[PDB]
Amino acid sequence: MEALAKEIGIPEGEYREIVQRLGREPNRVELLLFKVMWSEHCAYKNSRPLLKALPKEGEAVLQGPGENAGVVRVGEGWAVAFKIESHNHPSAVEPFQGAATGVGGILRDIMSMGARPIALLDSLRFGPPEEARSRYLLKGVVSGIAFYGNAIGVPTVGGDLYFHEGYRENPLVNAMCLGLLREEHLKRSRASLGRPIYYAGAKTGRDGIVGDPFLGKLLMEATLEAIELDLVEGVQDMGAAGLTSSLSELAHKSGLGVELHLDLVPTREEGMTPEELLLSESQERMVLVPKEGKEKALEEVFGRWGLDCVPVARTIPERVFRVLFRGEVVAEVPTEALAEAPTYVRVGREDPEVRRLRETPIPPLEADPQEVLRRLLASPNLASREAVYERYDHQVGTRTALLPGKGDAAVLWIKGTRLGVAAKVDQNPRYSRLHPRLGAMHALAEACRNVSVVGAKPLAYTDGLNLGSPETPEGYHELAETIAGLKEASEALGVPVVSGNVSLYNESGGKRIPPTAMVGVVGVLEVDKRAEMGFRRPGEVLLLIGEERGELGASEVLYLLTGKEFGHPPRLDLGREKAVQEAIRDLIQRGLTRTAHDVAEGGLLLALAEMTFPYGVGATVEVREEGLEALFGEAPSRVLFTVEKTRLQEATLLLEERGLPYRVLGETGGKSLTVLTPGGVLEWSLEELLSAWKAPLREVLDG
Ligand SMILES: Nc1ncnc2c1ncn2[C@@H]1O[C@H](COP(=O)(O)OP(=O)(O)O)[C@@H](O)[C@H]1O
Ligand SMILES: [Mg+2]
């Protein structure tokens, strides 16, 4: 029956392997099950072999890759679950539902760990902001993101937005979620023999073979209460491949099989066929396995939240996924056959054009810095995302609260404790397109730097990989270099992966999106020893860890002045990066500084301007090197911070004992940003910096 086989999308080679795993040919239904379970989305066929390289060990790791999300210990009995997913292709066809659905799904993965969602972060990539479609997609996904999150009660505390040429055809929408729980309640996707499997949530319809957040809230409370009462031994959310992936996965990890009675499955539409029920991806659906003797309890938990919770399947000793419908066995495939699909290895080769661009020498450039800073602040990639986060609410919850003082990483305070959880997601497409490996390294480094900058220690990360097809040598190369990049940054900084995602085939017409590894990092700190980026008072000494000179390759200023992106991305010394991150955390924990900000895209001056916005406090400094490289050039491992006058020596003593280059630029205060250079004084009023920075994205989004 190879006919229908290759007619649905299953490769001859793959089909032949399926007949040898079943010792027979699958019927129509079984064939449809494999088509979906063996697709790259579910099987990760081309990425698994490479992902084995990512370091997983870490002091704070409680749960790494394998479960619906990664979990790390944060102290005083608390733990944090988190993960990042993608909903690219669907957001492309319909931005509103795509984004909202991306949020619903990520939320369920975090809930299944028994962790109550405390925050959402979005990682977005669209084409240039002047193009109609780019504006459309941006309006769509943020509208959709706001809709689900605001309705379910989980705030979107931050994220990463970037506009770029390489995303014109394939936009990216990744959602990261943070959830907290008591370690004692850490649950996974396990089931013991002889247990019934419950189904709760919306009824199964003919969906993706729109999300309801209102029902999501109910679903979330019940699941969380159910686990908080220790009534379950396993919980699984239903997403891609619906019931099929939920149960087979659950069964496979449990070392046994599951018998599904489709007739007991709640239906929303009439005349639904077996495959339709099995492959529906209807939203807000949940699988739960009550512990022995707690079935009733589980039902009551859902009864309390006005939800139905009914038995739909049971575990069996035979490691198989047996599907029953109207009295007949319509499918019975071995669990292993469904969960362990073939993987592929290829030979990557870099796209010669990528090399050509990277090796292009950066030409001598000249421009009026008075205007370059204003032009950079007005760039849609550097301007305020204020109009975006204004769509979201619920910064204050029932256990956690977002600290309103703008820090480089979102900081969620755990009420009743001194604990604070910091989070950030990063990646630079320009660096990544020109040097995927260095781009990936920069992403993890930056994310960790941002958390370190508010005073928290990086505990682990989550990586949402987004690339073109792995078929072509150039594409596989980008995937390979991206993964090698993370490994290298991870090993050097001592920060392990705990979860993640992989989205491939993000390309059309031979045009590949810039390799995109959206790195999410979680860390913890004492809310009382926190730092934010805004200058808070006049008279503080302003210092810089690292050097003033940045590079122009793949930089913002280069793009602004040439309209192009080329050259080598900034070099990254992982040893320096680690030492700087520890230096800044020490500085903050010892109470020497409570205001820090790292120097990233746009260079020293842009970083400087961003610090005057939060409180309207200016700064006066001296930069010893003139030239674009010093004022706007980019370089990692650079951090700005302020100390109280009589504490300068202790801070400088600390940096010196760490062998770290540093400089005392000047002080804070006034209603201007003033910069002395060997060629004179450059000056801007905080007003002009502010208006230039505030307008760009606000009109694009609300105009
Ligand atoms: N790039 C990656 N890095 C680390 N872990 C990953 C990566 N991609 C996938 N994983 C892990 O492999 C598993 C598969 O993800 P997935 O099946 O898509 O979960 P779901 O479908 O419910 O969103 C998860 O445990 C996930 O955390
Ligand atoms: Mg930053």
XYZ file of C-alpha atoms and ligand atoms in Angstrom:
731
model
C 0.000 0.000 0.000
C 2.934 2.258 -0.834
C 0.476 4.109 -3.065
C -1.470 6.134 -0.501
C 1.721 6.102 1.581
C 3.729 8.409 -0.669
C 0.473 10.152 -1.608
C 0.138 11.615 1.895
C 3.786 12.601 2.271
C 5.590 9.565 3.684
C 8.976 8.862 1.995
C 9.509 5.453 0.385
C 12.467 4.813 2.664
C 10.488 5.834 5.734
C 7.481 3.759 4.689
C 9.645 0.699 4.182
C 10.965 1.171 7.710
C 7.425 1.369 9.071
C 6.453 -1.978 7.551
C 9.513 -3.569 9.142
C 8.686 -2.072 12.549
C 5.116 -3.395 12.371
C 5.974 -6.682 10.686
C 3.085 -5.762 8.389
C 1.626 -2.838 6.432
C -0.305 -0.169 8.373
C -3.951 0.456 7.510
C -5.075 3.917 6.397
C -5.439 5.254 9.958
C -2.073 3.908 11.120
C -0.460 5.429 8.034
C -1.920 8.832 8.895
C -0.549 8.468 12.433
C 3.007 7.957 11.174
C 2.818 10.786 8.650
C 2.290 13.133 11.603
C 4.427 11.477 14.297
C 7.362 11.133 11.896
C 7.170 14.687 10.523
C 10.094 16.953 11.447
C 7.797 18.927 13.755
C 7.248 15.942 16.050
C 10.254 13.733 15.322
C 13.133 16.226 14.995
C 14.669 13.862 12.436
C 17.429 16.173 11.193
C 18.223 17.934 14.471
C 18.403 15.166 17.087
C 21.893 13.921 16.082
C 23.261 17.452 16.586
C 21.344 18.331 19.762
C 23.100 15.542 21.668
C 26.097 17.888 21.869
C 24.415 20.462 24.137
C 25.639 20.225 27.792
C 22.813 19.375 30.254
C 24.459 19.122 33.700
C 24.015 21.928 36.224
C 23.648 22.450 39.985
C 20.144 23.912 39.698
C 18.715 21.455 37.158
C 15.758 19.410 38.413
C 14.436 18.442 34.982
C 16.147 18.725 31.602
C 15.135 17.877 28.000
C 12.655 15.015 27.816
C 9.658 16.482 29.596
C 7.197 19.160 28.484
C 9.494 21.809 29.978
C 12.759 22.407 31.805
C 12.778 22.995 35.553
C 15.451 24.541 37.737
C 15.726 25.092 41.483
C 15.480 28.718 42.622
C 15.628 28.265 46.386
C 13.630 28.342 49.604
C 11.735 25.349 48.268
C 10.691 26.964 44.990
C 11.383 25.801 41.441
C 10.814 27.354 38.025
C 9.678 25.631 34.859
C 10.176 27.264 31.487
C 10.465 26.633 27.781
C 10.200 28.342 24.411
C 8.118 27.149 21.439
C 7.453 28.406 17.927
C 4.292 28.905 15.817
C 5.872 30.275 12.665
C 3.997 28.806 9.693
C 0.594 29.197 11.362
C 1.269 32.821 12.342
C 2.187 33.416 8.726
C -1.209 32.231 7.419
C -3.177 34.038 10.122
C -1.126 36.143 12.604
C -3.870 36.590 15.167
C -4.752 32.945 15.756
C -1.192 31.801 15.186
C 0.231 33.953 17.980
C -2.649 33.418 20.407
C -2.428 29.677 19.853
C 1.306 29.812 20.343
C 0.628 31.346 23.749
C -2.023 28.798 24.716
C 0.238 25.874 23.857
C 3.339 27.129 25.679
C 1.123 27.790 28.717
C -0.087 24.193 28.759
C 3.457 22.791 28.586
C 4.366 24.783 31.687
C 1.135 23.804 33.466
C 1.723 20.119 32.836
C 4.830 20.372 35.040
C 2.509 21.561 37.806
C 3.953 25.060 37.578
C 1.659 28.067 37.624
C 2.505 30.389 34.686
C 3.929 33.655 36.028
C 5.225 35.165 32.828
C 5.320 35.142 29.026
C 8.040 36.508 26.742
C 7.671 36.853 22.979
C 10.429 36.551 20.383
C 9.360 38.118 17.081
C 10.916 38.458 13.622
C 9.258 40.218 10.663
C 10.478 41.863 7.460
C 11.347 45.627 7.296
C 8.893 47.843 9.283
C 8.062 50.079 6.307
C 6.488 47.225 4.337
C 2.730 46.747 4.575
C 2.828 43.040 5.352
C 5.391 43.503 8.102
C 3.068 45.992 9.793
C 0.126 43.659 9.281
C 1.833 40.641 10.878
C 3.107 42.740 13.788
C -0.389 44.055 14.458
C -1.813 40.553 14.171
C 0.494 38.621 16.505
C 0.598 41.239 19.262
C -3.207 41.594 19.093
C -3.466 37.822 19.383
C -0.813 37.570 22.090
C -2.541 40.267 24.148
C -5.893 38.540 23.685
C -4.883 35.198 25.139
C -2.551 36.435 27.847
C -4.794 39.215 29.100
C -7.748 36.842 29.172
C -5.931 34.023 30.979
C -4.249 36.255 33.552
C -0.596 35.765 32.616
C 1.406 38.892 31.757
C 3.833 39.129 28.894
C 6.757 40.710 30.747
C 9.099 41.253 27.830
C 10.688 39.671 24.807
C 12.604 40.464 21.632
C 11.371 42.192 18.459
C 13.437 42.679 15.310
C 12.680 43.667 11.727
C 14.795 42.171 8.951
C 14.940 41.476 5.212
C 15.515 37.760 5.710
C 12.142 37.326 7.403
C 9.990 38.859 4.667
C 8.734 35.433 3.480
C 8.932 33.493 6.718
C 8.170 35.498 9.862
C 8.937 34.047 13.278
C 6.777 33.896 16.369
C 8.204 32.131 19.412
C 6.670 32.280 22.876
C 8.505 31.600 26.107
C 6.746 30.842 29.380
C 7.795 30.912 33.047
C 5.959 29.008 35.764
C 6.622 28.487 39.456
C 5.873 25.622 41.781
C 6.905 23.987 45.019
C 9.659 21.486 44.239
C 7.734 18.858 46.212
C 5.074 19.001 43.468
C 7.322 18.449 40.462
C 5.323 16.237 38.088
C 6.078 14.848 34.621
C 4.498 12.636 31.954
C 4.441 9.266 33.718
C 1.796 6.593 34.238
C 1.785 3.291 36.131
C 0.272 0.042 34.940
C -3.470 -0.416 35.348
C -4.398 3.257 35.499
C -7.214 5.053 33.700
C -6.354 8.163 31.648
C -8.591 11.221 31.987
C -9.450 13.844 29.375
C -10.403 17.395 30.354
C -10.984 20.690 28.571
C -12.582 21.541 25.227
C -14.235 18.840 23.141
C -12.355 17.409 20.143
C -13.326 18.907 16.801
C -11.993 18.964 13.242
C -9.225 21.448 14.033
C -5.845 21.658 12.309
C -5.859 18.091 10.996
C -8.794 29.803 17.402
C -8.070 29.420 21.102
C -10.349 29.962 24.101
C -8.356 31.571 26.973
C -11.424 31.854 29.166
C -11.661 28.057 29.217
C -7.885 28.041 29.474
C -8.047 29.782 32.851
C -10.438 27.107 34.134
C -8.250 24.351 32.703
C -5.136 25.819 34.285
C -6.603 26.156 37.808
C -7.958 22.609 37.831
C -4.750 21.035 36.575
C -2.667 23.071 39.010
C -4.954 22.278 41.932
C -5.119 18.634 40.931
C -1.329 18.396 41.066
C -0.967 20.631 44.105
C -3.182 18.075 45.834
C -0.894 15.312 44.588
C -3.756 13.535 42.830
C -1.883 12.722 39.628
C 1.186 10.742 38.605
C 1.293 12.126 35.086
C -0.077 15.055 33.095
C 0.143 15.656 29.358
C -1.039 18.550 27.252
C -2.363 17.971 23.786
C -0.786 19.880 20.952
C 0.615 18.831 17.618
C -0.775 15.387 16.756
C -3.333 15.728 19.558
C -4.377 12.498 21.276
C -1.940 10.418 19.258
C 1.179 12.294 20.451
C -0.138 12.835 23.978
C -0.826 9.187 24.817
C 1.877 7.446 22.781
C 4.419 9.848 24.258
C 3.013 9.307 27.748
C 2.947 5.556 27.141
C 6.448 5.421 25.684
C 8.079 7.343 28.566
C 6.259 5.047 30.988
C 7.595 1.895 29.365
C 4.115 0.526 28.717
C 1.214 1.002 26.336
C -2.129 2.755 26.237
C -5.562 1.633 25.053
C -7.647 4.552 23.769
C -11.434 4.297 23.607
C -12.338 6.955 21.051
C -16.023 6.506 21.814
C -15.475 8.039 25.244
C -13.724 11.103 23.791
C -15.906 14.291 24.014
C -16.801 15.457 20.509
C -17.803 18.906 19.224
C -18.814 17.815 15.717
C -20.879 14.951 14.307
C -19.687 12.098 12.097
C -16.027 12.400 12.988
C -13.882 9.587 11.640
C -11.211 7.744 13.647
C -8.254 9.627 12.124
C -10.038 12.969 12.655
C -10.423 12.318 16.368
C -6.891 10.947 16.642
C -5.173 13.808 14.831
C -7.300 16.778 15.826
C -5.245 19.518 17.436
C -8.154 21.296 19.102
C -7.012 23.802 21.735
C -7.272 23.657 25.531
C -7.289 19.868 25.878
C -5.508 18.042 28.690
C -4.613 14.440 29.563
C -4.412 13.452 33.255
C -3.481 10.220 35.049
C -4.912 10.027 38.568
C -2.944 8.152 41.217
C -4.350 4.867 42.501
C -7.455 5.565 44.558
C -7.654 9.264 43.741
C -9.852 9.079 40.641
C -12.823 10.539 42.474
C -10.665 13.296 43.964
C -9.479 14.255 40.477
C -13.062 14.474 39.249
C -14.050 16.660 42.187
C -11.120 18.982 41.586
C -12.421 19.647 38.083
C -15.979 19.733 39.338
C -14.987 22.615 41.607
C -13.745 24.596 38.594
C -16.844 23.791 36.555
C -15.024 21.358 34.273
C -15.770 17.804 33.136
C -13.005 15.256 33.643
C -13.729 11.873 32.064
C -11.782 8.592 31.659
C -10.860 8.072 28.001
C -8.096 5.421 28.065
C -6.114 3.040 30.275
C -2.570 1.716 30.544
C -1.736 -1.824 29.440
C 1.492 -3.881 29.751
C 1.872 -4.404 25.995
C 4.007 -1.528 24.712
C 1.497 -0.495 22.065
C -0.878 2.316 21.169
C -4.183 0.496 20.682
C -7.066 2.559 19.375
C -10.662 1.404 19.824
C -13.638 2.902 18.023
C -17.225 1.676 17.925
C -16.182 -1.746 19.219
C -13.365 -2.314 16.734
C -9.594 -2.074 16.899
C -8.855 0.620 14.298
C -5.141 0.859 15.063
C -2.464 -0.871 17.095
C 1.078 0.240 16.460
C 4.063 -0.300 18.755
C 4.822 2.751 20.918
C 8.532 2.696 20.035
C 7.698 2.693 16.328
C 5.727 5.892 16.826
C 8.053 7.790 19.193
C 11.475 6.809 17.852
C 11.597 7.875 14.210
C 14.708 7.684 11.968
C 17.225 10.529 12.195
C 19.407 11.901 9.425
C 22.963 13.165 9.138
C 24.147 15.369 6.289
C 27.231 17.189 5.109
C 26.940 20.907 5.616
C 28.714 23.476 3.484
C 28.564 27.208 4.018
C 26.656 29.351 1.519
C 29.478 31.088 -0.412
C 27.485 34.323 -0.404
C 27.385 34.346 3.382
C 31.187 34.046 3.444
C 31.582 36.685 0.723
C 29.531 39.162 2.766
C 31.310 38.317 6.038
C 34.763 38.741 4.473
C 33.845 42.041 2.812
C 36.147 44.701 4.332
C 34.354 47.440 6.242
C 34.896 50.687 4.275
C 36.058 53.942 5.895
C 32.899 55.658 7.132
C 32.114 59.147 8.376
C 28.982 60.765 9.739
C 27.799 63.425 12.146
C 27.456 61.643 15.515
C 25.024 64.364 16.630
C 22.612 62.945 14.094
C 23.659 59.292 14.049
C 22.519 58.768 17.646
C 19.137 60.347 16.877
C 18.817 58.235 13.733
C 19.664 55.029 15.632
C 17.184 55.766 18.411
C 14.549 56.279 15.700
C 15.326 52.899 14.118
C 12.417 50.446 14.504
C 14.928 47.871 15.763
C 16.234 50.141 18.544
C 13.242 52.347 19.441
C 10.915 51.877 22.423
C 8.702 48.744 22.378
C 6.483 50.723 24.780
C 3.440 50.664 22.462
C 3.675 46.862 22.476
C 3.777 45.962 26.194
C 1.077 48.578 26.806
C -1.310 46.031 25.284
C -0.587 43.631 28.144
C -1.648 43.786 31.807
C -1.551 41.640 34.967
C 1.972 42.590 36.038
C 0.704 41.982 39.588
C -0.450 38.440 40.348
C -1.397 36.104 43.192
C 2.163 35.006 43.973
C 4.464 37.011 41.744
C 4.791 40.625 40.623
C 6.775 42.301 37.873
C 9.071 45.026 39.196
C 8.177 48.207 37.213
C 11.691 49.675 37.293
C 13.111 48.875 33.852
C 15.965 46.392 34.199
C 17.806 44.568 31.387
C 15.888 41.407 32.262
C 12.342 40.987 33.524
C 12.351 40.426 37.288
C 9.397 38.603 38.848
C 9.233 38.929 42.638
C 7.938 35.948 44.579
C 5.721 37.526 47.238
C 6.296 36.382 50.790
C 9.975 35.774 50.030
C 13.132 37.681 49.189
C 13.379 35.722 45.958
C 13.294 37.204 42.491
C 13.301 35.379 39.156
C 14.957 37.077 36.174
C 14.337 36.217 32.519
C 15.357 37.365 29.067
C 15.360 36.065 25.490
C 17.873 37.224 22.852
C 19.371 36.761 19.390
C 20.811 39.126 16.809
C 19.863 38.219 13.196
C 22.622 40.309 11.593
C 25.376 38.493 13.508
C 23.588 35.183 12.941
C 23.106 35.568 9.173
C 26.793 36.417 8.654
C 28.218 33.948 11.184
C 25.591 31.531 12.554
C 27.982 29.972 15.085
C 29.089 33.345 16.505
C 25.467 34.506 16.381
C 24.335 31.595 18.564
C 27.183 32.237 21.017
C 26.270 35.917 21.190
C 22.636 35.032 21.916
C 23.342 32.861 24.962
C 26.024 35.283 26.145
C 23.710 38.307 25.827
C 20.777 36.582 27.530
C 23.027 35.558 30.427
C 24.534 39.055 30.538
C 21.088 40.638 30.753
C 20.133 38.492 33.735
C 23.513 39.072 35.389
C 23.043 42.793 34.853
C 19.950 42.971 37.072
C 21.874 41.013 39.679
C 20.757 37.446 39.118
C 22.787 34.301 38.428
C 22.065 32.372 35.180
C 20.647 28.976 36.127
C 19.927 27.489 32.697
C 18.582 28.332 29.281
C 16.009 27.297 26.697
C 16.701 27.595 22.963
C 14.125 28.074 20.257
C 15.907 27.187 17.030
C 14.441 28.533 13.770
C 16.166 27.812 10.460
C 15.624 27.047 6.808
C 15.486 23.582 5.318
C 18.158 21.141 6.581
C 18.066 19.429 3.180
C 20.435 21.779 1.362
C 24.088 21.797 2.570
C 23.899 25.541 3.352
C 20.844 25.069 5.557
C 22.214 22.063 7.430
C 25.415 24.025 7.902
C 23.530 26.868 9.582
C 21.735 24.382 11.831
C 25.001 22.685 12.687
C 26.880 25.937 13.372
C 23.966 27.276 15.415
C 24.019 24.228 17.660
C 27.835 24.291 17.939
C 27.558 27.951 18.887
C 25.257 27.236 21.840
C 27.406 24.331 23.014
C 30.489 26.525 23.080
C 28.805 29.414 24.906
C 27.073 26.999 27.259
C 30.290 25.228 28.216
C 32.226 28.436 28.768
C 29.567 30.166 30.895
C 28.566 27.030 32.768
C 24.888 27.362 31.871
C 23.090 24.181 30.653
C 20.060 23.619 28.368
C 16.939 22.476 30.115
C 14.452 22.601 27.239
C 13.846 24.161 23.865
C 12.340 23.890 20.411
C 13.356 23.427 16.799
C 11.531 24.850 13.803
C 12.943 23.947 10.390
C 11.993 24.587 6.766
C 11.585 28.310 7.387
C 12.367 29.338 3.825
C 10.695 29.878 0.476
C 12.117 30.027 -3.030
C 15.628 29.191 -1.897
C 15.553 32.170 0.476
C 16.524 31.093 4.008
C 15.692 33.137 7.112
C 18.712 34.281 9.113
C 19.673 31.406 11.429
C 17.738 32.179 14.593
C 18.503 30.732 18.005
C 16.227 32.551 20.434
C 17.884 31.961 23.781
C 15.843 32.302 26.938
C 17.680 32.433 30.245
C 16.303 32.199 33.757
C 18.153 33.207 36.899
C 17.441 34.089 40.515
C 18.387 36.880 42.895
C 17.356 38.597 46.113
C 14.860 41.278 45.162
C 16.644 43.485 47.676
C 19.917 43.224 45.734
C 18.637 44.115 42.285
C 19.816 46.583 39.678
C 17.923 48.370 36.939
C 19.191 50.286 33.922
C 17.814 53.752 34.600
C 19.938 56.525 36.059
C 18.108 57.172 39.311
C 19.893 60.143 40.842
C 22.430 62.874 40.012
C 26.022 62.744 41.276
C 26.632 59.022 40.877
C 29.937 58.007 39.316
C 29.395 56.286 35.954
C 31.818 53.506 34.995
C 32.273 51.075 32.114
C 33.514 47.476 32.390
C 35.365 46.696 29.157
C 36.539 49.058 26.417
C 35.008 51.932 24.452
C 35.915 50.586 21.030
C 33.315 48.439 19.325
C 33.394 46.920 15.830
C 31.266 47.905 12.823
C 30.738 44.517 11.176
C 27.072 43.500 11.032
C 26.302 46.474 13.265
C 23.322 48.779 13.511
C 25.323 51.871 12.618
C 26.700 50.102 9.545
C 23.196 49.283 8.338
C 22.040 52.844 8.987
C 24.906 54.356 6.988
C 25.217 51.877 4.096
C 21.794 50.306 4.089
C 23.621 46.988 4.109
C 24.903 44.259 6.423
C 28.323 42.714 5.949
C 31.676 42.303 7.658
C 32.636 40.078 10.576
C 30.328 40.205 13.635
C 31.980 41.368 16.884
C 34.504 38.898 18.290
C 33.354 37.240 21.505
C 35.819 36.262 24.236
C 33.821 33.861 26.362
C 36.415 34.061 29.117
C 36.031 37.814 29.374
C 32.236 37.499 29.113
C 32.080 35.133 32.094
C 34.406 37.278 34.208
C 32.372 40.409 33.430
C 29.080 38.685 34.316
C 30.477 37.569 37.664
C 32.046 40.960 38.246
C 28.725 42.735 37.741
C 26.777 40.290 39.908
C 29.348 40.640 42.723
C 29.248 44.406 42.435
C 25.459 44.348 42.832
C 25.214 41.689 45.568
C 27.732 43.601 47.677
C 25.493 46.643 47.290
C 28.143 48.664 45.441
C 25.747 49.362 42.557
C 22.018 49.173 41.865
C 22.053 50.571 38.344
C 23.612 48.703 35.426
C 23.030 48.286 31.705
C 25.019 46.303 29.165
C 26.275 47.844 25.932
C 24.752 46.014 22.976
C 23.466 47.014 19.562
C 24.016 50.672 18.728
C 27.165 51.009 20.813
C 28.213 52.989 23.871
C 26.195 56.123 23.110
C 22.912 54.329 22.495
C 23.340 52.363 25.737
C 24.013 55.668 27.477
C 20.848 57.270 26.075
C 18.669 54.325 27.133
C 19.709 54.894 30.737
C 18.369 58.444 30.814
C 14.837 57.482 29.694
C 13.417 55.687 32.781
C 13.787 58.591 35.245
C 14.772 61.525 33.061
C 18.207 61.808 34.676
C 21.006 62.714 32.246
C 24.760 62.077 32.212
C 28.072 63.824 31.533
C 31.062 61.806 30.373
C 34.235 61.687 28.326
C 34.976 59.207 25.560
C 38.677 59.131 24.684
C 38.281 57.765 21.195
C 36.319 59.536 18.515
C 35.058 57.763 15.431
C 32.019 55.606 14.826
C 33.726 52.524 16.233
C 33.945 54.094 19.682
C 30.608 55.865 19.807
C 28.432 53.297 18.006
C 30.570 50.234 17.326
C 29.406 47.001 18.917
C 31.280 44.597 21.235
C 30.089 42.054 23.828
C 31.113 41.759 27.459
C 30.698 45.503 28.085
C 28.702 46.848 31.059
C 27.873 50.311 32.403
C 27.062 50.934 36.075
C 27.027 53.657 38.706
C 28.346 53.793 42.269
C 27.829 56.269 45.056
C 30.728 58.749 45.176
C 32.314 57.397 48.372
C 32.244 53.821 47.035
C 34.251 54.334 43.852
C 37.506 52.900 45.215
C 35.999 49.600 46.410
C 34.358 49.076 43.032
C 37.497 49.889 41.089
C 39.486 47.697 43.449
C 37.129 44.802 42.654
C 37.370 45.177 38.873
C 41.161 45.376 39.111
C 41.413 42.181 41.168
C 39.507 40.557 38.299
C 41.976 41.838 35.704
C 39.113 43.583 33.917
C 39.632 46.651 31.715
C 37.423 49.498 32.917
C 36.964 53.263 32.836
C 35.412 56.047 34.868
C 33.456 57.907 32.173
C 31.844 60.578 34.355
C 28.689 61.180 36.408
C 24.897 61.248 36.192
C 22.606 64.243 36.408
C 21.011 67.041 34.446
C 18.614 67.106 31.525
C 21.183 66.341 28.852
C 23.502 63.626 27.640
C 26.908 65.301 27.286
C 29.945 63.577 25.786
C 33.444 65.023 25.716
C 35.602 63.661 22.892
C 39.141 64.669 21.878
C 37.446 66.750 19.183
C 34.934 68.673 21.257
C 31.690 68.182 23.156
C 28.737 66.313 21.688
C 25.397 67.148 23.313
C 21.719 66.172 23.227
C 18.788 67.211 25.401
C 16.994 64.284 27.043
C 13.899 65.561 25.262
C 15.181 65.031 21.711
C 16.618 61.618 22.579
C 13.309 60.648 24.138
C 11.018 61.783 21.301
C 13.246 60.213 18.661
C 13.213 56.904 20.570
C 9.513 56.895 21.496
C 7.809 57.554 18.131
C 9.032 54.792 15.693
C 7.250 51.630 16.836
C 4.270 53.472 18.271
C 3.142 54.740 14.877
C 4.046 51.501 13.100
C 1.858 49.596 15.565
C -0.794 52.257 16.162
C -0.712 54.106 12.844
N 16.583 22.918 20.429
C 16.292 22.246 21.602
N 17.104 22.349 22.677
C 16.839 21.705 23.825
N 15.760 20.931 23.955
C 14.892 20.769 22.932
C 15.132 21.433 21.698
N 14.126 21.103 20.862
C 13.302 20.303 21.476
N 13.728 20.064 22.752
C 13.065 19.211 23.749
O 12.598 17.957 23.136
C 11.194 17.739 23.488
C 10.275 17.908 22.242
O 9.620 19.191 22.194
P 8.049 18.988 21.796
O 7.741 17.574 21.447
O 7.751 19.921 20.505
O 7.128 19.450 23.075
P 5.672 20.050 22.617
O 5.268 19.499 21.293
O 4.518 19.599 23.761
O 5.771 21.653 22.517
C 10.896 18.729 24.643
O 11.168 18.095 25.900
C 11.838 19.898 24.354
O 12.135 20.660 25.528
Mg 20.400 44.742 27.282
